[PDB]
Ligand binder design. Structure first.
Ligand SMILES: O=C(O)CCCC[C@@H]1SC[C@H]2[C@@H]1NC(=O)N2C(=O)OCc1ccccc1
Ligand SMILES: O=C(O)CCCC[C@@H]1SC[C@H]2[C@@H]1NC(=O)N2C(=O)OCc1ccccc1
Ligand SMILES: O=C(O)CCCC[C@@H]1SC[C@H]2[C@@H]1NC(=O)N2C(=O)OCc1ccccc1
Ligand SMILES: O=C(O)CCCC[C@@H]1SC[C@H]2[C@@H]1NC(=O)N2C(=O)OCc1ccccc1
Ligand SMILES: *[C@@H]1O[C@H](CO)[C@@H](O)[C@H](O)[C@H]1NC(C)=O
Ligand SMILES: *[C@@H]1O[C@H](CO)[C@@H](O)[C@H](O)[C@H]1NC(C)=O
Ligand SMILES: *[C@@H]1O[C@H](CO)[C@@H](O)[C@H](O)[C@H]1NC(C)=O
Ligand SMILES: *[C@@H]1O[C@H](CO)[C@@H](O)[C@H](O)[C@H]1NC(C)=O
Lengths: 122, 121, 121, 122
């Protein structure tokens, strides 16, 4: 199969994201609803934007996107690869950086968390 | 007041441009890297991202994705735009560079991480 | 009561042993990886690290370094030991694999990052 | 020159660390005094332990170490390479993960920060 980004996905936390169509330059838009937050705020649905790499028209492309959170001053980016898994299902295997806002450039050292996120189609 | 729009460089000698940021915090840009993990000839590549506009912070967070035109890889960057008394700006960012692998059993080795600090041209 | 001492495995089928932990929180262990970024034959390698004992938490953080015997690389792991209802343990860790580069100009590409979840074997 | 880990180092935060002799199995011990913390706690000098890789006895070895902080429940690991810089000085280029203690497994996702640290002698 070719692995496509377009569709509704979910992860183990129960966070969901929807990615729209991917255009000829590899650009896509979507929305992300996170299950969990580092804020003390009400979570809202937040937009994301990114690109899939189309060099050599790989069936399992890499891609990246940015989630522009609407209830926090933070930003997360994700990057990964759209695989066909051993069981034939599409899966997105990604890593992320969550950048918090700090007040002072001397506090920049602690502003970035890292992690993984694995998505399956919902 | 710290704006991402401009031409930027880092110590590695890579440059990036970022254009205007629209009311939804979106922007497009270009990135010309001085270095590569590929043995391919480097080409200028496009980037796209967003600046966070919650509470209209003067030192906003942001992220963008670089869609490399000479490899199968993708890099994302996230960071913050810092600006001092004299209006001098610095973007402090961290990145993940995702390589393509052929088999999902090699996924574990596919992601590099590092920092990039940009200043204006 | 989440203890690191034991034999552990991950989904790649790598295994690790960790022996007794000191009153100083030091431990020694071994790692036999299922996968390598090198083209060399894998060999069992030693590891050394510490568990944090502050407030003697039941679910302590810890870190350790694996000194690979078949490559010029080093990997460090850091995480937390979680234990459930039935006394079932899982170590959730993240790791940086540092490759050797010959020239300092190539340092930017030398560090890979990932996760590893271990269960008792 | 061969790049040696043993000695007293500092970074741009003003954090200092002292590494002792490296033994024949590549092991070393030291102490770390951080300038900053992500906690609301009082900082104290803390021990570190790690190893240098001695495969092919490279003059610029990789290494890793763990700082077992004595004033928080956190752990940081650092890994990197001891280079001789273009100017002939020793420099340790490292990256780190700082693992915070979370109370529950559901919150694991947010417990790891990442960053760089570059050290120079004295
Ligand atoms: O707090 C803010 O400032 C804004 C909101 C940030 C939400 C973060 S983005 C990374 C993480 C969180 N949500 C999510 O789905 N993540 C994620 O890592 O999911 C994958 C996962 C699955 C199972 C277990 C752990 C992580
Ligand atoms: O090879 C591929 O597959 C595609 C090309 C990947 C290019 C990588 S993206 C991160 C790194 C490299 N270029 C660059 O400017 N980076 C960077 O880290 O420079 C940042 C820097 C900032 C401040 C000081 C020193 C270096
Ligand atoms: O090549 C070298 O230079 C020296 C050897 C490096 C081995 C690396 S250390 C991190 C990674 C690899 N082995 C392992 O068990 N890891 C690991 O990530 O396992 C966790 C895992 C579990 C399921 C799926 C993917 C990863
Ligand atoms: O808080 C806790 O939970 C326990 C203590 C953690 C101390 C952290 S470990 C990584 C970081 C901090 N200190 C330090 O020297 N680091 C560091 O990154 O310094 C390098 C640096 C130099 C200049 C600018 C930014 C970073
Ligand atoms: C994910 O979508 C599923 C099914 O539609 C829903 O039950 C779940 O609550 C959603 N997660 C969030 C964070 O909204
Ligand atoms: C960045 O711009 C400078 C000055 O214009 C130029 O000399 C340098 O070659 C550019 N860097 C790259 C990687 O093209
Ligand atoms: C892990 O241990 C099992 C035996 O328990 C063994 O079959 C497997 O080969 C080990 N993995 C490696 C990489 O040695
Ligand atoms: C670093 O060492 C210097 C003495 O050379 C000292 O002034 C400074 O406060 C030390 N840093 C810390 C965090 O104690």
């Amino acid at each position: 199969r070719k692995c496509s980004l377009t569709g509704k996905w979910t992860n183990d936390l129960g966070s969901n994201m929807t990615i729209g169509a991917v255009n000829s330059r590899g650009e896509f838009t979507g929305t992300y609803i996170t299950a969990v937050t580092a804020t003390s705020n009400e979570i809202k649905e937040s937009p994301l934007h990114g690109t899939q790499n189309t060099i050599n028209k790989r069936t399992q492309p890499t891609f990246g996107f940015t989630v522009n959170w609407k209830f926090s001053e933070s930003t997360t980016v994700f990057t990964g690869q759209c695989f066909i898994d051993r069981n034939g299902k599409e899966v997105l295997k990604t890593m992320w950086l969550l950048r918090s806002s700090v007040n002072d450039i001397g506090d920049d050292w602690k502003a970035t968390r890292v992690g993984i996120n694995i998505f399956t189609r919902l």
